[PDB]
Symmetry: C2
Subunit: 306 residues, 2 copies
């Protein structure tokens, strides 16, 4: 009885998107109060991003070279600063639709919503997790840089991601809103590996609890095991280790279903070594790891937030 | 290189949601211009929805018994009418954030975004298809009735669904915005089957083209076949028949990939009779049918709408 991947309402973020052009070359920015945030890649053409010295490139661009347009109206840029990999453009007008907001740096395994935007206009909204190798697996095509990822706590928006790069392997990399990349990546076009993309174990377990809360539980066995026993099977299949913190976090879901966390681990261990054998769980032929335990809590009794 | 299930931006719809209470019993309504639309189930308690005579129940409720609250502010109800399975509440205030909009009735295989709302507050947004048996497979918990489904054509919102019912099997049923149920379902709690949930063939094919546009095409064989040949394998696996209209609609995707529509049918026929054998396509272990060809066009060159 049903449990969709779904994103936060995006209205509060739509009201913050603008178009930023430098060298008539265009991408997205985020307008909060009287500051516009965008990737510092705006000042680059090519070669530049083949070998960019951002400090020297920024030397003789100036305030008037940054063209910021919002809705259909032009913002006046009255200053600018580079902080890590983002440019801050001070404008002389506060965004009168600025929401309550915070800037967070999140953590692999964390989920968030992305509002994919093209030259300042939002076109789609969807969910992802931050992967354990510090990439995300998004849908970003040309002009999408500067699109942001966000969470919400009923009223206030938690901005956690800004899109900068697509690696040659097709996965995506970006920064927090202070301009620091997640993981080892840089805003240049050379060579840079993503490491192993391990499965986020605690999220899979939360999703299995969701599946039970809706009655799709052929996979419930009876076996139990221990943390160490389970983790020894986890390395095998490049699942992230599970620890007590993650057991603790799953507590409310065990409380409600009556299924002990380590018993659910035992079903997962059996599934990893047996494979669905043609069955599905909640409409999926594989084990989904893009739901956190709190995501499940927002649905897993379908009662989000107050 | 990446292709997410993603919904339309929902901001234009968030601005239209209100809370409607009758018999201090509460659900969601849609406020456009000076009319609020909601399920006529608002006038029911239980028994009532066990055996509801809506005409007789509506007799001695009145304008003042309909409590409409939006934001934190109270709307004055100055009239009401029942049209099929929806109630229209005339209020004395136009919604000053009414978007451009149309009311459409869609067609099995059609996709749309749902803004799932709880006592007037939106909590999540996600995509679905209308199934060929006239159900959708949503995520709707208590108080969710009256949440709506919508498309967009750059500026104007196409409202196509209002949520009314969860069947005993766990799937969902509702109406268009004129109050006519999709399929055979009624707003009462007795017995009512959903028929066969066939797979939407033309959508699967569009998604296979998407997979190629991003390079995940081990499944490309070389076989071809005919419409009739393919459909004879389609019945087998309760896929919807494919016809010329659907071939026509896939034309732009064949044009760009160089893969003839019937050649792609031949890969699909091979996949249905061989199974992935442990492989994935675009992160899925099964064949996804919740993308239309035009959905793919909105991404499949990542260039939505103008």
């Amino acid at each position: 009885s049903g449990f969709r991947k779904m994103a936060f309402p995006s209205g509060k973020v739509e009201g913050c998107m603008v178009q930023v052009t430098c060298g008539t070359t265009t991408l997205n920015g985020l307008w909060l109060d009287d500051v516009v945030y965008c990737p510092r890649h705006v000042i680059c053409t090519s070669e530049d991003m083949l070998n960019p010295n951002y400090e020297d490139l920024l030397i003789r661009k100036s305030n008037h070279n940054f063209l910021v347009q919002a809705g259909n109206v032009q913002l006046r840029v009255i200053g600018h600063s580079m902080q890590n990999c983002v440019l801050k453009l001070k404008v002389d007008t506060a965004n009168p639709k600025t929401p309550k907001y915070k800037f967070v740096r999140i953590q692999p395994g964390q989920t968030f919503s992305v509002l994919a935007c093209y030259n300042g206009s939002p076109s789609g909204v969807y969910q992802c997790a931050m992967r354990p190798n510090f990439t995300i697996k998004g849908s970003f095509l040309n002009g999408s840089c500067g699109s942001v990822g966000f969470n919400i706590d009923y009223d206030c928006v938690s901005f956690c991601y800004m899109h900068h790069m697509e690696l040659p392997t097709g996965v995506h990399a970006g920064t927090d809103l202070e301009g620091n990349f997640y993981g080892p990546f840089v805003d240049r076009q050379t060579a840079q590996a993503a490491g192993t993309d391990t499965t986020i174990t605690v999220n899979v377990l939360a999703w299995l609890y969701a599946a039970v809360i809706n009655g799709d539980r052929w996979f419930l066995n009876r076996f139990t095991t221990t943390l160490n026993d389970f983790n020894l099977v986890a390395m095998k299949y490049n699942y992230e280790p599970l620890t007590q913190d993650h057991v603790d976090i799953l507590g409310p879901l065990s409380a409600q279903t009556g299924i002990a966390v380590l018993d659910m681990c035992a079903s997962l261990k059996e599934l990893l070594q047996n494979g669905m054998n043609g069955r599905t769980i909640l409409g999926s032929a594989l084990l989904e790891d893009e739901f956190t335990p709190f995501d499940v809590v927002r649905q897993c009794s379908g009662v989000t937030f107050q």
